Amino acid sequence: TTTAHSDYEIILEGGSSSWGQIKGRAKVNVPAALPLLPADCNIKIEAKPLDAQKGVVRFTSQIESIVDSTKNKLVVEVDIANETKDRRIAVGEGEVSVGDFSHKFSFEGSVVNMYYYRSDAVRRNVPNPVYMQGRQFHDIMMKVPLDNKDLIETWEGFQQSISGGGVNFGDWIREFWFIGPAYTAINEGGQRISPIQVNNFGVESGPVGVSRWKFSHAGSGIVDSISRWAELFPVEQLNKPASIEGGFRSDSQGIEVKVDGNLPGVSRDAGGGLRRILNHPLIPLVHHGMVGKFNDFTVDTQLKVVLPKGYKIRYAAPQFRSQNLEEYRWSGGAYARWVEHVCKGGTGQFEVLYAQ
Amino acid sequence: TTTAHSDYEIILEGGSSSWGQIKGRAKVNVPAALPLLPADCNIKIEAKPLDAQKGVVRFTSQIESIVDSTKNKLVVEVDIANETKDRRIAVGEGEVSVGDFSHKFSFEGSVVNMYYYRSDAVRRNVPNPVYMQGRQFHDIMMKVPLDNKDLIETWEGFQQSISGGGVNFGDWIREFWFIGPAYTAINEGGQRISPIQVNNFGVESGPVGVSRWKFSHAGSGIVDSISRWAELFPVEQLNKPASIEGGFRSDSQGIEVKVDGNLPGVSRDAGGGLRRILNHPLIPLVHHGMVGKFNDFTVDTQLKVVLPKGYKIRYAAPQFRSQNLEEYRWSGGAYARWVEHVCKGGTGQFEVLYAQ
Amino acid sequence: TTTAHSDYEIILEGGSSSWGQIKGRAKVNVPAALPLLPADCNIKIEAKPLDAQKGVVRFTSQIESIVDSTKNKLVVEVDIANETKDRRIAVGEGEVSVGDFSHKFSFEGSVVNMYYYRSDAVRRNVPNPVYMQGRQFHDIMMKVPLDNKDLIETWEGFQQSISGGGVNFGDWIREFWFIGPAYTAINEGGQRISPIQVNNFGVESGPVGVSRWKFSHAGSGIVDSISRWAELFPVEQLNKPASIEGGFRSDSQGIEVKVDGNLPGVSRDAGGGLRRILNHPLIPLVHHGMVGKFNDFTVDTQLKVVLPKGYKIRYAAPQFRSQNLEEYRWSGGAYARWVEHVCKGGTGQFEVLYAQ
Ligand code: BCL
Ligand code: BCL
Ligand code: BCL
Ligand code: BCL
Ligand code: BCL
Ligand code: BCL
Ligand code: BCL
Ligand code: BCL
Ligand code: BCL
């Protein structure tokens, strides 16, 4: 039969901490939807405080994959900091490699989040606001050394598309950028991508391809990068290194995945002396929903939540199945149906409130 | 197991009447997709003839909900009438309230429906036309007394967005307006929303926020508000009050709903001396289809149709299961699969033709 | 219970041939999603070499349907040839008929495919490239004799929409053109349709409606008409007539279909001395995915592959169930789950590599 076997774990820190140790694992005997298989991928993300006075974080990521025998790699190292409550800045470098090909880059970017409104009538009356509409502005400057024949070729293609295309370049680049079903997923999350504005495009003197470009993306409220702008970057809680790792193996007969992290932001002040496990980000559910409906499956799942010592759940919906002091478990019944729901694209709230 | 239990009833008036008494009830042990739960909502709609000579209808609606403990209310009272076969006019007032907040409004609007074509080649050859492409133009003037700090604040935000945004205001307002997955649902129904054109925005003298704005929406044929413009407002059949009521209760473990109404338009002349139960509106099926695929379910359903005395079904597909004179019932087999189909987004025709 | 019963067959030619005899049949006891039923349709397509020196193909198609008792017919005869590796030309004629109505047409068109990039870094490292982004330009000149009242009426409507609409005509025509859920399907495949540009619209002297119009369509890589431009027209392999036939019967209780063809392009050089059955086109899967999720179903399927004499499979994923020399069969297990997957919108690769 078709069965999804999964295990999730949440271990929460108490006091003034929002930190949690999270774990996930799943295996399902269904094909992945990728038109090129097998596909294996590993991701690691680390965030460490560089300067707590200026709120500078050193964010490092490494992604390695094998897709239909092609070996890929992305490495990135970036310094991130808020400048204002709406403007964040990033300065970094990295390298992208595919088989016998590689290219290096350096960049500087500013990202400005703009909520469409501010209302005390909403703030006073909605205890847990979810959908928050807005638009977010990117201004990117990037540099790539044109140190091989392939980089020269692609740079020349962009020179032709930018000069030839005119107003069409910034418009038509969107379907090049959002390759395959990444394009389809834009509308799926109530998201919009503006045309690209080219401020600078040129070759510096070996030769270096230089560019400065801008775009905005917007959301009707599902887009967490906009609705939860401050929360998604919990620099104020980063008093030590945080890290997350994920990995999957897939082919036309199965998918297997494991995630483990230790990071701030797992819990949040819910008000009235209560705390919550953070609201589930909506984009992962909505996007995974585009693949989660291709095969009927039974659910064999368990969630384990371990609160800090002397703390207890005050409200849980779906209700936990069993308890032993600070440890709570969810399996079968209502929780298994919620698991099926969210794997298929559902965004139905699973809420956990705790205190003491 | 996961089971959808539902009951539907249709009681038809005969002679020159298109009226029917409709009833629906359903319960399913699945979470709702709302990222904020529990959520309960009740709706009541009434339409009464004010002036049959001018074809003026008094349309009143009241919606009350509780979402994650927040109490909401919408009350609206409107005078509606056709001016031409394409232009309808509406003059009304209402109130929107959320928790400790409330605001009143008055409005005047004109809505012009424009079918993209008229063809006798289509009219002569298609006995039951469904997809009809068109565009529909709204021209709205609205007034809100700015009688609290919140209204002043929001009005000021709109003053900044309208003057600052310029051409961007009418464009970017769409993702603010179609909150969360309402934005996603636009494309889902083959629907389009034009940018908003601001004709007037200002403060009148307490202070009153005044605005006049325009937009058009279009459809490729699924949009019933366009394809079935005259049919959706059966003023010619409104010789007495019509009314409909609906209510639901939902949380992360279940959904329960009941609908009951007595209204014209339930049956329609099918031609050749036959009558049909009206074609199923496509938008409800297509939109509910965005939530109906999150959990596998078994179907426990029944539809009961009661024709007027001495009338009989001449054709039914899916075929009814049983009959007793003017009463017909559908359950199990083909009908249960059609029920599953339409709950998931399917628009497959279920046709009932009757006469005598 | 709900069961999809299907049988597929592939018989491959060897040596320098890419030709294959393909067969498909399926029956499922579910309603079709069409809001007008019953619906039966037959299609026949033939391609024959007219001139191998100029690479001219005579492509003929005939489509006949009955939808809710309305009898329809489309007949087309066209001369197609590549002019360059990016530009193809078509010159043809046909007739569209619905019930008591009919109209004839003649046309000339050029279609220019434009891949967004060319990269040797991609070519050297990706053994089987799938997503290829691009845009494709249509330039159509068409003529219809206005020999009945209906043609005069529609021509007059277009005269009003073109002169009245101005810039709006080319924009709003898209929802008229992509009737019903054809509009929704555009975004679904990561596809874009540009506004129509009208170069010529007029009446010639009986009266003939004349028009010249242009549009482009683009894809993020799922759009096979763009990604696989040369492959979808295998003129170099057309040394004799190729033909395909398909037919379906559907209503609110069932769907039944059969396809049979004999055509080039069924196999392709995979490199390294290996051959593959061609990559599955993504658009059919993605589009059928919009209807394939409305009813849970069990899978009763078989695929039979017959290689040319002395050839063997070197790799198959999902793995074949059984073998007897050059004959291989897939049924149950992993293949049945892949069948369920692709019927619901999944694009997960099923790969067959063979040699000798
Ligand atoms: C298909 C399954 C669903 C899903 C199903 C569930 C379920 C079921 C539960 C949670 C729970 C939680 N999930 Mg979730 N969740 C998804 C994806 C996300 C993402 C994300 C960035 O993608 C985030 C930030 C979260 C966040 C959270 C917290 C709100 C919460 C506690 C952590 C936990 O138990 O994790 C468990 C870890 C996982 C489910 C692993 C998810 C891995 C995702 C799919 C990303 C894999 C990326 C891969 C390794 C690399 C991709 C590389 C690119 C190809 C380049 N989820 C995916 C899409 N999630 C729990 C909760 O609500 O507690 C109150 C809970 O019970
Ligand atoms: C995802 C939705 C939005 C988006 C939302 C945001 C948000 C929100 C932010 C940025 C930020 C930035 N974005 Mg942006 N961004 C988008 C698309 C782009 C594209 C592109 C070509 O598509 C580019 C070039 C950029 C460029 C940039 C840089 C200017 C800057 C830092 C990026 C970086 O370091 O990434 C390197 C990172 C990776 C390669 C992996 C990231 C994987 C995912 C996204 C991580 C989620 C967190 C995970 C669940 C938990 C991590 C825990 C660890 C313990 C830390 N964005 C899309 C349209 N972007 C950030 C910034 O610093 O601005 C100044 C910022 O705050
Ligand atoms: C934000 C995007 C990342 C990036 C991410 C990747 C990834 C991921 C991949 C490549 C790959 C390729 N990249 Mg790179 N690449 C960047 C910058 C560059 C620059 C440059 C001078 O800035 C050049 C010449 C190249 C060149 C190339 C090709 C040689 C190579 C294969 C074709 C292709 O898919 O191109 C894709 C080209 C781009 C993504 C960006 C090109 C930028 C141009 C030249 C200048 C700016 C144009 C405009 C203002 C902004 C465009 C925004 C992007 C569409 C997101 N990249 C930056 C640092 N690039 C692929 C590869 O290795 O294949 C074997 C691959 O998988
Ligand atoms: C999920 C289930 C499907 C659905 C499944 C079925 C089934 C199954 C049957 C019909 C049947 C009919 N339906 Mg239907 N139908 C839906 C929604 C609609 C809507 C609408 C405005 O939403 C309309 C006008 C109709 C109209 C009709 C008639 C064509 C026909 C006879 C009435 C009847 O039996 O009703 C029964 C009543 C219902 C199914 C209740 C539907 C309630 C919908 C979901 C709206 C609830 C709104 C809620 C109370 C308030 C929302 C407030 C906002 C949040 C602010 N349906 C929903 C989306 N319908 C029958 C038929 O074809 O007869 C020939 C039949 O057998
Ligand atoms: C729904 C698809 C279209 C749409 C289609 C139509 C159609 C069609 C008509 C209007 C009408 C109007 N619309 Mg409009 N309209 C849309 C979006 C809007 C928006 C907005 C901010 O989104 C606004 C402000 C308006 C504004 C207006 C007013 C000018 C006018 C009367 C509205 C009213 O009284 O509602 C108060 C009503 C409610 C709060 C509840 C309505 C719930 C649903 C929509 C009712 C369906 C009927 C139900 C199944 C059966 C009822 C039976 C009873 C016995 C009567 N429309 C969307 C884009 N609109 C009507 C008019 O009079 O024009 C002059 C008209 O005929
Ligand atoms: C057609 C839309 C309805 C309407 C429906 C609702 C609903 C439903 C809700 C609110 C809520 C709010 N409304 Mg109101 N509201 C209208 C008219 C107004 C006017 C005005 C002077 O005309 C003002 C100042 C306000 C102000 C406010 C906020 C104080 C409040 C919380 C923020 C928010 O969501 O705003 C939303 C603001 C709007 C929907 C319209 C603002 C119109 C502006 C000021 C003038 C016209 C601008 C432009 C020409 C047209 C915009 C079209 C709309 C986007 C649909 N509304 C009209 C009568 N409003 C929410 C609330 O109570 O939260 C606690 C809430 O749930
Ligand atoms: C719903 C089912 C899926 C589907 C499921 C499968 C399965 C399962 C298998 C293949 C296989 C193959 N399919 Mg497929 N396939 C679909 C549609 C397509 C289309 C197309 C133009 O629509 C093409 C070109 C192909 C091509 C191919 C080859 C890559 C491969 C070998 C041929 C074969 O076995 O065919 C079998 C024939 C069919 C499945 C019939 C498909 C008929 C489609 C739905 C079109 C019917 C049109 C109708 C008659 C007329 C419409 C008229 C309009 C209304 C005007 N498929 C549909 C959408 N296909 C096999 C493979 O991968 O081998 C390695 C395999 O095992
Ligand atoms: C499908 C995605 C694209 C598209 C992709 C392409 C591609 C790719 C090509 C054309 C070609 C042409 N297109 Mg175009 N075209 C689109 C929409 C249109 C529309 C429209 C009103 O929507 C029009 C008027 C045209 C017009 C034209 C003509 C200029 C020309 C020949 C058409 C013809 O003979 O069809 C008559 C055909 C039919 C009525 C049936 C076709 C059914 C499907 C599409 C066939 C698939 C092949 C099947 C799986 C296997 C066949 C095997 C046989 C043994 C041959 N296109 C959409 C947006 N078009 C071709 C050309 O010659 O250009 C110069 C060409 O190469
Ligand atoms: C590429 C499109 C095909 C075509 C495919 C079909 C199909 C399929 C159907 C009709 C049907 C109709 N067609 Mg025809 N039709 C074409 C050309 C024409 C021309 C013309 C002088 O060129 C005229 C006057 C007509 C007229 C008509 C109507 C009398 C009739 C019913 C209304 C309707 O759906 O119209 C649809 C009208 C069109 C599809 C095209 C009209 C073109 C106009 C007059 C001139 C060009 C305008 C602009 C530059 C380009 C528009 C592109 C299209 C939107 C795809 N067609 C060409 C050859 N037509 C329907 C029917 O028989 O109903 C009983 C039907 O099912």
The one-character DSSP state at C356 is: -
Answer whether C344 sits within 8 Å of A35, measured CB to CB: no
Do residues B259 and B43 make contact, with C-beta atoms less than 8 angstroms apart?
Answer: no
| CA angle C350–C353–C356, rounded 5-degree value | 160
- The reported resolution of this PDB entry, expressed in Å, is 2.0
Do residues A354 and A274 make contact, with C-beta atoms less than 8 angstroms apart?
Answer: yes
Do residues A175 and A182 make contact, with C-beta atoms less than 8 angstroms apart?
Answer: no
Nearest Cα residue to atom 43 of ligand 7: C284
The one-character DSSP state at A236 is: G
In this structure, what CATH number is given to the domain that contains residue B195? Answer: 2.50.10.10
Answer whether A31 sits within 8 Å of C116, measured CB to CB: no
Alpha helices (H) in C148-269, listed in sequence order: 149-165, 167-177, 181-188, 224-227
Do residues A198 and A109 make contact, with C-beta atoms less than 8 angstroms apart?
Answer: no
C-alpha to C-alpha distances, A147 to A157, A160, B105, nearest whole angstrom: 16, 20, 65
Nearest Cα residue to atom 66 of ligand 6: B98
Q: How many CB atoms lie within 10 A of CB B293?
A: 19
Do residues C237 and C265 make contact, with C-beta atoms less than 8 angstroms apart?
Answer: yes
Q: The tokens 């030769």 sit on which residue?
A: A207
Please name which of A347, A356, A349 lies closest in space to residue A283, comparing C-alpha atoms: A347
Q: How far apart are CA A46 and CA A43, in angstroms?
A: 10
Q: How far apart are CA A199 and CA A137, in angstroms?
A: 14
Pair of tokens at residue A176: 């090049």
Q: How far apart are CA A1 and CA C299, in angstroms?
A: 12
Do residues B221 and B130 make contact, with C-beta atoms less than 8 angstroms apart?
Answer: yes
The one-character DSSP state at A31 is: -
Do residues B31 and B230 make contact, with C-beta atoms less than 8 angstroms apart?
Answer: no
Quickly list DSSP for C119-133: -HHHHHH-SS-----
Q: How many CB atoms lie within 10 A of CB A269?
A: 10
Do residues A332 and B22 make contact, with C-beta atoms less than 8 angstroms apart?
Answer: no
Please name which of A215, A234, A225, A230 lies closest in space to residue A189, comparing C-alpha atoms: A225
Is B320 an interface residue toward C (CB < 8 Å)? no
Three-state SS at A157: helix
* Strand duo A20-28 + C134-145: pairing: unpaired
C-alpha to C-alpha distances, C207 to C148, C149, C152, C163, C211, nearest whole angstrom: 10, 12, 9, 20, 13
β-strand partners of C98:
C72, C101
Nearest Cα residue to atom 31 of ligand 5: B90
Pair of tokens at residue B110: 């004109």
Pair of tokens at residue A1: 């039969």
Please give the torsion angle defined by the CA atoms of residues A50, A97, C350 and C43, in that order, rounded to the nearest 10 degrees. Answer: 110
Radius of gyration from C-alpha coordinates of chain C: 22
For residue A2, the CA-to-ligand 1 centroid distance in Å is: 21
Burial letters B87-97, b for 16+ CB under 10 A, else e? ebebebebebb
Is A162 an interface residue toward C (CB < 8 Å)? no
C334 Rama sector, left if φ>0, alpha if ψ -120 to 50, beta otherwise: alpha
3-class SS shares of chain C: helix, strand, coil, % to 5: 20, 50, 30
Length of chain B: 356
Nearest Cα residue to atom 46 of ligand 5: B232
Nearest to A178 among C117, C220, C351 (CB): C220
- Chain C residues in contact with B352 by the CB 8 A cut-off are none
Answer whether B348 sits within 8 Å of C37, measured CB to CB: yes
Is B179 an interface residue toward A (CB < 8 Å)? yes
Please name which of A295, A74, A69, A116 lies closest in space to residue A223, comparing C-alpha atoms: A116
The one-character DSSP state at C280 is: P
User: What does the H/E/C string look like for A178-222?
Assistant: CCCHHHHHHHHCCEEECCCEEEEEEEECCCEEEEEEEEEEEECCC
Q: Nearest ligand, CA of residue B96?
A: 6
Shortest CA gap C271–chain A (Å): 14
Answer whether B120 sits within 8 Å of C150, measured CB to CB: yes
Q: For chain A, positions 88-147, list CB contacts with chain B under 8 A.
A: 116-122, 124-128, 130-131, 133, 135
Is B349 an interface residue toward C (CB < 8 Å)? yes
Q: Hey, what amino acid is at A258?
A: K
User: What does the H/E/C string look like for A293-325?
Assistant: CCCCCEEEEEEEEECCCCCEEEEEECCCCEEEC
Which residues, in sequence order, are CB contacts of C166 under 8 Å at separation 6+? none
Do residues A141 and A211 make contact, with C-beta atoms less than 8 angstroms apart?
Answer: yes
Binding partners of B (≥3 Cβ pairs within 8 A): A, C
Do residues A243 and A263 make contact, with C-beta atoms less than 8 angstroms apart?
Answer: yes
Three-state SS at A86: coil
* Number of domain units in chain A: 1
Sign of CA dihedral B216, B221, B225, B229: positive
Q: How many CB atoms lie within 10 A of CB A185?
A: 17
Q: How many CB atoms lie within 10 A of CB B52?
A: 12
Do residues A196 and A257 make contact, with C-beta atoms less than 8 angstroms apart?
Answer: no
Q: How many helices (H) and strands (E) does chain A have?
A: 7, 20
Please name which of B246, B234, B242 lies closest in space to residue B44, comparing C-alpha atoms: B246
Three-state SS at A79: strand
Binding partners of A (≥3 Cβ pairs within 8 A): B, C
Do residues C292 and C343 make contact, with C-beta atoms less than 8 angstroms apart?
Answer: yes
The one-character DSSP state at B319 is: P
Determine if the peptide bond prior to A49 is cis (ω within 30°).
Answer: no
- Chain B residues in contact with C184 by the CB 8 A cut-off are 187-190, 220, 222
For residue C267, the CA-to-ligand 8 centroid distance in Å is: 22
Pair of tokens at residue A2: 């078709």
Nearest to A181 among C135, C190, C293 (CB): C190
Measured in degrees and rounded to the nearest 5, phi and psi for residue B320 equal -70, 150
Q: How far apart are CA A43 and CA A65, in angstroms?
A: 9
For residue B225, the CA-to-ligand 5 centroid distance in Å is: 9
Q: How far apart are CA A36 and CA B280, in angstroms?
A: 41
β-strand partners of A23:
A9, A260
Please give the torsion angle defined by the CA atoms of residues C280, C282, C284 and C289, in that order, rounded to the nearest 10 degrees. Answer: 120
Residue spans of beta strands (DSSP E) within B174-321: 191-193, 197-204, 208-219, 242-251, 254-263, 267-271, 274-277, 298-306, 312-317
- Chain B residues in contact with C31 by the CB 8 A cut-off are 318, 334, 337-338, 341, 346, 348-350
Is B294 an interface residue toward A (CB < 8 Å)? yes
Please name which of C113, C129, C110, C109 lies closest in space to residue C121, comparing C-alpha atoms: C129
Sign of CA dihedral C84, C87, C92, C97: positive
Quickly list DSSP for C29-56: SS--S-SS--EEEEEEEEEEEEETTTTE
β-strand partners of A40:
A66, A249
How far is C-alpha C314 from the geometric centre of its chain's CA atoms?
29
- Chain C residues in contact with A294 by the CB 8 A cut-off are 340-341, 344-346, 348
C-alpha to C-alpha distances, A34 to A4, A184, B286, C285, C340, nearest whole angstrom: 19, 14, 27, 12, 15
Please name which of C145, C120, C260, C124 lies closest in space to residue C204, comparing C-alpha atoms: C145
Q: How many CB atoms lie within 10 A of CB A84?
A: 8
Answer whether A33 sits within 8 Å of C130, measured CB to CB: no
Q: How far apart are CA C50 and CA A88, in angstroms?
A: 64
Shortest CA gap B289–chain A (Å): 12
Residue B232 C-beta-side C-alpha neighbours within 13 Å: 15
Pair of tokens at residue A280: 């589930």
- Chain A residues in contact with B185 by the CB 8 A cut-off are none
Is B196 an interface residue toward A (CB < 8 Å)? no
Nearest Cα residue to atom 39 of ligand 3: A177
Three-state SS at C156: helix
Please name which of B255, B243, B247 lies closest in space to residue B65, comparing C-alpha atoms: B247
Answer whether A296 sits within 8 Å of C340, measured CB to CB: yes
Please state the atom number of ligand 1 nearest to the C-alpha of residue A74.
Answer: 55
Mutate which of B5, B8, B178 for ligand 4? The one with the most ligand atoms within 8 Å of its CB, which is B8
- Chain B residues in contact with C295 by the CB 8 A cut-off are 337, 340-341, 344, 346
Pair of tokens at residue B206: 């307490």
Residue C153 C-beta-side C-alpha neighbours within 13 Å: 10
Pair of tokens at residue A230: 């401050």
Q: Is C89 in the pocket of ligand 8 (CB under 6 A)?
A: yes
Do residues B18 and B262 make contact, with C-beta atoms less than 8 angstroms apart?
Answer: no
Please give the torsion angle defined by the CA atoms of residues C257, C261, C264 and C267, in that order, rounded to the nearest 10 degrees. Answer: 50
Burial letters B255-281, b for 16+ CB under 10 A, else e? bbbbbebbbbbbbbebeeeebbbbbbb
Distance between start and end Cα atoms, chain A: 44
Please name which of B139, B192, B153, B197 lies closest in space to residue B173, comparing C-alpha atoms: B197
Burial letters B23-35, b for 16+ CB under 10 A, else e? ebebbbbbbbbbb
The burial of A339, by beta-carbon neighbours within 10 Å (0-12 exposed, 13-18 middle, 19 or more buried), is given as: buried
| CA angle A79–A84–A85, rounded 5-degree value | 105
Q: How far apart are CA C168 and CA C145, in angstroms?
A: 27
Question: Domain of B21?
Answer: 1-356
Q: How far apart are CA C305 and CA B51, in angstroms?
A: 73
Q: How far apart are CA A134 and CA A114, in angstroms?
A: 6
Mutate which of B76, B227, B280, B299 for ligand 4? The one with the most ligand atoms within 8 Å of its CB, which is B280
Three-state SS at A337: helix
Q: The tokens 């059984």 sit on which residue?
A: C322
- Chain C residues in contact with B280 by the CB 8 A cut-off are 35
Please name which of C355, C321, C314, C356 lies closest in space to residue C338, comparing C-alpha atoms: C321
Measured in degrees and rounded to the nearest 5, phi and psi for residue B338 equal -65, -40
Q: The tokens 């808020």 sit on which residue?
A: A82
Q: How many helices (H) and strands (E) does chain C have?
A: 7, 20
Q: How many CB atoms lie within 10 A of CB A116?
A: 20
How far is C-alpha A181 from the geometric centre of its chain's CA atoms?
17
The one-character DSSP state at B84 is: S
For residue B240, the CA-to-ligand 2 centroid distance in Å is: 60
- Chain C residues in contact with B282 by the CB 8 A cut-off are 35
Q: How far apart are CA A313 and CA B282, in angstroms?
A: 44
Residue A137 C-beta-side C-alpha neighbours within 13 Å: 10
Please name which of B287, B50, B65 lies closest in space to residue B191, comparing C-alpha atoms: B287
Measured in degrees and rounded to the nearest 5, phi and psi for residue A55 equal 65, 40
Q: How far apart are CA B198 and CA B281, in angstroms?
A: 32
Long-range contacts of the stretch A248-251 (C-beta < 8 A, 24+): A248/A39, A248/A40, A248/A41, A248/A42, A249/A38, A249/A40, A250/A31, A250/A32, A250/A34, A250/A37, A250/A38, A250/A39, A250/A40, A251/A31, A251/A32, A251/A37, A251/A38, A251/A39, A251/C317
Binding partners of C (≥3 Cβ pairs within 8 A): A, B
Distance between start and end Cα atoms, chain C: 44
Q: How far apart are CA C308 and CA C19, in angstroms?
A: 11
For residue A311, the CA-to-ligand 3 centroid distance in Å is: 50
Q: How many CB atoms lie within 10 A of CB C134?
A: 22
Q: How far apart are CA C141 and CA C122, in angstroms?
A: 38
Alpha helices (H) in chain A, listed in sequence order: 120-125, 149-165, 167-177, 181-188, 224-227, 282-288, 333-343
| CA angle C104–C105–C108, rounded 5-degree value | 165
Measured in degrees and rounded to the nearest 5, phi and psi for residue C87 equal -105, 130
Sign of CA dihedral A163, A168, A170, A172: negative
With CA atoms as reference, the chain B residue closest to A218 would be B175
Q: How far apart are CA C93 and CA A98, in angstroms?
A: 48
Q: How far apart are CA C232 and CA C215, in angstroms?
A: 20
Please give the torsion angle defined by the CA atoms of residues A54, A74, A257 and A238, in that order, rounded to the nearest 10 degrees. Answer: -10
Residue spans of beta strands (DSSP E) within chain B: 3-12, 20-28, 39-51, 56-67, 70-82, 87-98, 101-115, 134-145, 191-193, 197-204, 208-219, 242-251, 254-263, 267-271, 274-277, 298-306, 312-317, 322-324, 327-330, 351-355
How far is C-alpha C80 from the geometric centre of its chain's CA atoms?
16
Q: How far apart are CA C86 and CA C71, in angstroms?
A: 38
Q: How far apart are CA B10 and CA B285, in angstroms?
A: 19
- B160 membership: H or E segment, kind and range: helix B149-165
Longest dimension (CA), chain B: 68
User: What does the H/E/C string look like for C296-350?
Assistant: CCEEEEEEEEECCCCCEEEEEECCCCEEECCEEEECCHHHHHHHHHHHCCCCCCC
Burial letters B144-180, b for 16+ CB under 10 A, else e? bebeeebbeebbeebeebeeeeeeebbbbbbbbebbb
How far is C-alpha B199 from the geometric centre of its chain's CA atoms?
28
Pair of tokens at residue B211: 């605005």
